């Protein structure tokens, strides 16, 4: 009275109910307070400094009177700002704010597993800071201040300078921020977060293109990796909720779909031309909140393993690799667009940058990562230490004295 077909159906029930459960257990953290995905810096500022209650700092306050104070990671990265960027002074305030927010989200959410990308891949080739007038690195990377900006018409004009920051993590094989500047007022921010080839996770993308201080293009997306070009229910619910929370007004469509994003864009992908400081502020809030939600949902992600036993996991891994290859190829055939900012730094160098950095796909190369995860233990035991049996006896004597005196 059960039948094989209905045993298979019962399996299907259990199987996708577990999926549903996981999805809502991942959305529930953002369901209540979506503004907490953006106002976290302001809330940490309102929280203010924290008195470091470690015994060494307490002894410092007892002897010298100096008080050790700590700050949350949000206001820590707000104090840092852009950071020690080589081109932090020539960039636009909007680009600087966005870079500070996304880098702070990386260094805060992905702490204890955020590594710097291997220097032999991007930094030993001098791609951390490239200048149009010095393509051969004859000035040891000091061309940005060693060489004055070209005159109009004079060879080298307009000068293009690109600074890159590539990171790795436990769940992410490449977290890439690229800031490009040109003399004609054009600035480009390109932030792409790549999951590894073991996670059923979309690739995060953002591109901010501005001309002469006015934002002309602003794209933020969680580009899917599946075959049907659709995201998971938690990603769809989070993107719709954040759009409702932060976009609020404006026109509802706001999607030109310029014939190249249609193979990589999510159904809730945002690609606007900002017209107004209010719309620009709403986009910046939505983008910071979406990045924070993406990184927060990265914490509980479980890698997909295959081999013996079952083959649907192997099919999922092949789908992940195909989707990442499709995204990389679609960003590589982008040469009717952003690649025009290149060619000034040659064509063969443009190819040797495009294929090797940013959008690079390889089945055999997974970047190594260092998951410390014991600095949490060290900080916890500096906050709450154990002082030994002799100190326990001394505290017992002190407690007895205060009981018999007070």
């Amino acid at each position: 009275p059960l039948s094989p077909e209905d045993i298979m159906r019962l399996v299907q029930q259990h199987e996708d109910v577990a999926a549903a459960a996981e999805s809502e257990q991942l959305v529930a953290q953002f369901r209540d307070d979506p503004q907490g995905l953006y106002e976290y810096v302001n809330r940490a500022y309102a929280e203010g400094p924290r008195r470091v209650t470690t015994p060494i700092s307490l002894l410092q306050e007892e002897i010298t009177g100096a008080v050790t104070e700590s700050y949350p990671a949000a206001v820590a990265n707000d104090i840092i700002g852009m950071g020690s960027w080589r081109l932090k002074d020539d960039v636009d305030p909007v680009i600087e704010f966005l870079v500070a927010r996304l880098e702070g989200c990386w260094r805060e959410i992905l702490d204890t597993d955020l590594c710097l990308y291997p220097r032999e891949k991007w930094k030993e080739q001098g791609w951390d800071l490239v200048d149009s007038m010095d393509p051969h690195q004859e000035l040891e990377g000091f061309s940005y201040a060693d060489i004055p900006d070209p005159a109009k018409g004079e060879a080298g004009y307009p000068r293009l300078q690109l600074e890159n920051r590539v990171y790795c993590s436990k769940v992410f094989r490449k977290l890439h921020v690229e800031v490009g500047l040109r003399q004609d007022g054009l600035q480009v921010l390109h932030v792409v977060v790549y999951p590894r080839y073991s996670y059923d996770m979309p690739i995060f993308g953002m591109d901010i293109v501005m001309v002469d201080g006015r934002v002309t293009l602003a794209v933020v997306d969680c580009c899917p990796v599946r075959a049907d070009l659709k995201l998971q229910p938690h990603y769809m619910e989070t993107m719709a909720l954040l759009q409702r929370t932060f976009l609020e007004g404006t026109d509802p469509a706001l999607r030109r779909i310029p014939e190249w994003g249609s193979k990589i864009f999510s159904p809730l992908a945002l690609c606007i031309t900002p017209s107004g400081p209010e719309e620009l502020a709403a986009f910046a809030k939505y983008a910071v909140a979406l990045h924070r939600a993406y990184l927060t949902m990265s914490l509980n992600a479980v890698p997909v393993v295959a081999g013996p036993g079952d083959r649907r996991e192997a099919a999922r891994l092949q789908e992940i690799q195909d989707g990442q290859k499709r995204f990389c190829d679609n960003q590589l055939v982008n040469k009717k667009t952003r690649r025009v900012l290149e060619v000034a730094m040659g064509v063969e160098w443009t190819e040797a940058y495009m294929s090797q950095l940013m959008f690079d796909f390889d089945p055999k190369y997974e970047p190594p990562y260092f998951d410390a995860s014991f600095e949490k233990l060290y900080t916890y035991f500096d906050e709450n230490p154990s002082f030994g049996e002799m100190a326990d006896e001394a505290m017992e004597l002190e407690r007895g004295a205060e009981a018999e005196r007070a």
Binding site: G81, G83, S84, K88, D89
Partner: peptide
């Protein structure tokens, strides 16, 4: 070893001339 801290302070400092001055050698 002596001058590393001042070097990092110089490398991590915002130049305020491009945030202060607004719009021959322009």
């Amino acid at each position: 070893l002596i001058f590393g801290g001042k070097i990092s302070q110089l490398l991590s400092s915002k130049n305020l001339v491009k945030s202060l001055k607004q719009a021959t050698h322009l």
